[PDB]
Design a binder for this molecule. Structure first.
Ligand SMILES: CCCCCCCCCCCCCC(=O)OC[C@H](COP(=O)(O)OCC[N+](C)(C)C)OC(=O)CCCCCCCCCCCCC
Ligand SMILES: CCCCCCCCCCCCCC(=O)OC[C@H](COP(=O)(O)OCC[N+](C)(C)C)OC(=O)CCCCCCCCCCCCC
Ligand SMILES: CCCCCCCCCCCCCC(=O)OC[C@H](COP(=O)(O)OCC[N+](C)(C)C)OC(=O)CCCCCCCCCCCCC
Ligand SMILES: CCCCCCCCCCCCCC(=O)OC[C@H](COP(=O)(O)OCC[N+](C)(C)C)OC(=O)CCCCCCCCCCCCC
Ligand SMILES: CCCCCCCCCCCCCC(=O)OC[C@H](COP(=O)(O)OCC[N+](C)(C)C)OC(=O)CCCCCCCCCCCCC
Ligand SMILES: CCCCCCCCCCCCCC(=O)OC[C@H](COP(=O)(O)OCC[N+](C)(C)C)OC(=O)CCCCCCCCCCCCC
Ligand SMILES: CCCCCCCCCCCCCC(=O)OC[C@H](COP(=O)(O)OCC[N+](C)(C)C)OC(=O)CCCCCCCCCCCCC
Ligand SMILES: CCCCCCCCCCCCCC(=O)OC[C@H](COP(=O)(O)OCC[N+](C)(C)C)OC(=O)CCCCCCCCCCCCC
Ligand SMILES: CCCCCCCCCCCCCC(=O)OC[C@H](COP(=O)(O)OCC[N+](C)(C)C)OC(=O)CCCCCCCCCCCCC
Ligand SMILES: CCCCCCCCCCCCCC(=O)OC[C@H](COP(=O)(O)OCC[N+](C)(C)C)OC(=O)CCCCCCCCCCCCC
Ligand SMILES: CCCCCCCCCCCCCC(=O)OC[C@H](COP(=O)(O)OCC[N+](C)(C)C)OC(=O)CCCCCCCCCCCCC
Ligand SMILES: CCCCCCCCCCCCCC(=O)OC[C@H](COP(=O)(O)OCC[N+](C)(C)C)OC(=O)CCCCCCCCCCCCC
Ligand SMILES: CCCCCCCCCCCCCC(=O)OC[C@H](COP(=O)(O)OCC[N+](C)(C)C)OC(=O)CCCCCCCCCCCCC
Ligand SMILES: [Ca+2]
Ligand SMILES: [Ca+2]
Ligand SMILES: [Zn+2]
Ligand SMILES: [Zn+2]
Length: 248
């Protein structure tokens, strides 16, 4: 089947390699080319490729895989400590939206993704449409001012600030990415949106392959979505009641 990374110039691989560093600000194991190449061989194994040390655009696909291009550690304007909201009530506002698709495809899917987190965790989410809110969600073109290289269609699709009392909590989706609703020839917004919002709620990734924000995240709509309740158990301590026989 056709894809873009098989028709783009060889330059893509060093770009995609350079990209890997920014996921943590720095990564010590992605620094030195000896280690770059050792850790890219480890990427192929983690994803399940039949050749560790393949040179094929399939390997670019695992490097550019739908996720953000930002420090996914406490950083991207944050002190060292796990972020969480200081309440169980949070608001949100769709400040902006896409022209290739009507408003619904945002407003109903951010809400639905927040509903995914907020049925399990007793988090209340209120929609603001005029006024101040906690989570300012916008769709933007990437000339508007964030660190790192700009981005259009291709690698990187949102950034998200973790729970903050002003400037934090908030996301900018990529309006130059082609998101779908009914058409299927885009990135599934609801899918992507979930971990974008998971950022806005202050969670991390999980080693459990039943987890949603497991890094081998994709573009198209899941068949077999599930949560690790094992991860969420320590989120339930932060917003939920203490109700053990020994601790209540
Ligand atoms: C008979 C004449 C009719 C003319 C109709 C023109 C269209 C009227 C309806 C649409 C207005 C469009 C406004 C516009 O595109 O703003 C462009 C930018 C806005 O920043 P931008 O990111 O585009 O939009 C941000 C807000 N967002 C994300 C929430 C949508 O903001 C700018 O780039 C700066 C805007 C500076 C305007 C200065 C004052 C202009 C006065 C014109 C008065 C003419 C009187 C005849
Ligand atoms: C007092 C007299 C009556 C007054 C009427 C009401 C006036 C209301 C003014 C509204 C100002 C709102 C502020 C603002 O940010 O407006 C932004 C708008 C809509 O934003 P939005 O709907 O978010 O789209 C954002 C821009 N986009 C597509 C690049 C992603 O951006 C636009 O809508 C862009 C407008 C582009 C117009 C370009 C020229 C079109 C030509 C029309 C004629 C064509 C003749 C062949
Ligand atoms: C010599 C003096 C005059 C010189 C005038 C020259 C041109 C001045 C233009 C200034 C603004 C240029 C910016 C521009 O073209 O905005 C375009 C807008 C919105 O673009 P937008 O949807 O933001 O993104 C466009 C994506 N694209 C190009 C791939 C389709 O596109 C439009 O909004 C067109 C969409 C259809 C509008 C329908 C208009 C029907 C007539 C309505 C009459 C209403 C009562 C007045
Ligand atoms: C830099 C400036 C360049 C020059 C600008 C020249 C004048 C431009 C006037 C505004 C053009 C408005 C175009 C317009 O969208 O007409 C149709 C709309 C909605 O049609 P719809 O298919 O929703 O939107 C099509 C356009 N799209 C894809 C670009 C969003 O119909 C509606 O949205 C319903 C509106 C009903 C209420 C109207 C109340 C205001 C009356 C006076 C408006 C005077 C406008 C100057
Ligand atoms: C009675 C016969 C009528 C004949 C045609 C008249 C054309 C007048 C404008 C009609 C515009 C239709 C309304 C509209 O806003 O269309 C915008 C389109 C593209 O919007 P876009 O969202 O790509 O459509 C995507 C649709 N989707 C999501 C389902 C894939 O398109 C654009 O954004 C650009 C549209 C450019 C229009 C240029 C009009 C210049 C007219 C001749 C002017 C001569 C001046 C001397
Ligand atoms: C002084 C400046 C002047 C500048 C221009 C001002 C005047 C502008 C006129 C603007 C009107 C444009 C309307 C237009 O583009 O309609 C397109 C339609 C399809 O619209 P459609 O895709 O349903 O709109 C979807 C929009 N969405 C996604 C937001 C829901 O297209 C159709 O559905 C076509 C249907 C044809 C049906 C059959 C008609 C038979 C006609 C036979 C006539 C006699 C033949 C001898
Ligand atoms: C006395 C005859 C006057 C005849 C011309 C009157 C002109 C009226 C201009 C109104 C300008 C509004 C500009 C703008 O949209 O401001 C938005 C604000 C708040 O927006 P926002 O907070 O989103 O509104 C939320 C509440 N909502 C949806 C239910 C409206 O909305 C507001 O805060 C409303 C602001 C109203 C201001 C009216 C100022 C009048 C000074 C008149 C001085 C004497 C003139 C001879
Ligand atoms: C004599 C009676 C007046 C008595 C005054 C008594 C004192 C009242 C003080 C009122 C204080 C509230 C002021 C105010 O903000 O009222 C807003 C309303 C509703 O605005 P709303 O739509 O809720 O918010 C809209 C957007 N916004 C905030 C950005 C401006 O504004 C509206 O409801 C007006 C809506 C006008 C839309 C008209 C568009 C169609 C015009 C014709 C178009 C023809 C096309 C062929
Ligand atoms: C007649 C000789 C020439 C004939 C050919 C004309 C060809 C015109 C070519 C148009 C080229 C642009 C096409 C286009 O799709 O533009 C869409 C834009 C959005 O671009 P987009 O990348 O979304 O945002 C760009 C932002 N910018 C301007 C800060 C870099 O939409 C805009 O940025 C919205 C425009 C908003 C301007 C603010 C209007 C304020 C009110 C002014 C009222 C003026 C009355 C005199
Ligand atoms: C009824 C009145 C309608 C007019 C109303 C007033 C509207 C005034 C708004 C002017 C908007 C200017 C915005 C602007 O400069 O943005 C840059 C755009 C497109 O940039 P773009 O191609 O996207 O590349 C820039 C962004 N990049 C590298 C990140 C991809 O554009 C450009 O790069 C090219 C700008 C070309 C201007 C050409 C003017 C030539 C005629 C001027 C008049 C001469 C006779 C007096
Ligand atoms: C003679 C007529 C007098 C007209 C006087 C109008 C006074 C209007 C006050 C507008 C105040 C806007 C204040 C403000 O900064 O709002 C912020 C938002 C978004 O801010 P921000 O997210 O930084 O936008 C980032 C995107 N960037 C940097 C790439 C452009 O962006 C905005 O909300 C967009 C504001 C666009 C408003 C354009 C005003 C002219 C529209 C046409 C009205 C025509 C009437 C016939
Ligand atoms: C009489 C009372 C008037 C009071 C009006 C109040 C206006 C408040 C506007 C707030 C607009 C908020 C959104 C805005 O910042 O858009 C910025 C855009 C592009 O952002 P960016 O591309 O990031 O450039 C940022 C830096 N800047 C502003 C120095 C160029 O910046 C640009 O694209 C520059 C836009 C330049 C103006 C184009 C419209 C001129 C209108 C011509 C009207 C002729 C009437 C006969
Ligand atoms: C007759 C001889 C003199 C006239 C010479 C005219 C030369 C015109 C150069 C016009 C600009 C060309 C570059 C251009 O298309 O920039 C595009 C952007 C955005 O297009 P748009 O689809 O929003 O881009 C969205 C993102 N995308 C690409 C991923 C789909 O658009 C923007 O960012 C906004 C651009 C504002 C342009 C203001 C000038 C419009 C033309 C005015 C001509 C008036 C002549 C009197
Ligand atoms: Ca992108
Ligand atoms: Ca905020
Ligand atoms: Zn993450
Ligand atoms: Zn930003």
């Amino acid at each position: 089947l056709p894809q873009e990374a098989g028709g783009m110039s060889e330059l893509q691989w060093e770009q995609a390699q350079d990209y890997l560093k920014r996921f943590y600000l720095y990564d010590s194991e992605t620094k030195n080319a000896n280690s770059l190449e050792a850790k890219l061989k480890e990427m192929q194994k983690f994803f399940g490729l039949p050749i560790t040390g393949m040179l094929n655009s399939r390997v670019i696909e695992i490097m550019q895989k739908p996720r953000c291009g930002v420090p996914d550690v406490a950083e991207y304007s944050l002190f060292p400590n796990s972020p969480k909201w200081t309440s169980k009530v949070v608001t949100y506002r769709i400040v902006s939206y896409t022209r290739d698709l009507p408003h619904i495809t945002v407003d109903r899917l951010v809400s639905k993704a927040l509903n995914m987190w907020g049925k399990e965790i007793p988090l209340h989410f209120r929609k603001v449409v005029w006024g101040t809110a906690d989570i300012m969600i916008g769709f933007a073109r990437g000339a508007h001012g964030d660190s790192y290289p700009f981005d259009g269609p291709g690698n990187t699709l949102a950034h998200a600030f973790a729970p903050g009392t002003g400037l934090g909590g908030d996301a900018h989706f990529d309006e130059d990415e082609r998101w779908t609703d009914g058409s299927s020839l885009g990135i599934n917004f609801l899918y992507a949106a979930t971990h974008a919002l998971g950022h806005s709620l202050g969670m991390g990734h999980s080693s459990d392959p039943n987890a949603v924000m497991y890094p081998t995240y994709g573009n198209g709509d899941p068949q077999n979505f599930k949560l690790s309740q094992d991860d969420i158990k320590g989120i339930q301590k932060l917003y939920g009641k203490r109700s053990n026989s020994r601790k209540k």
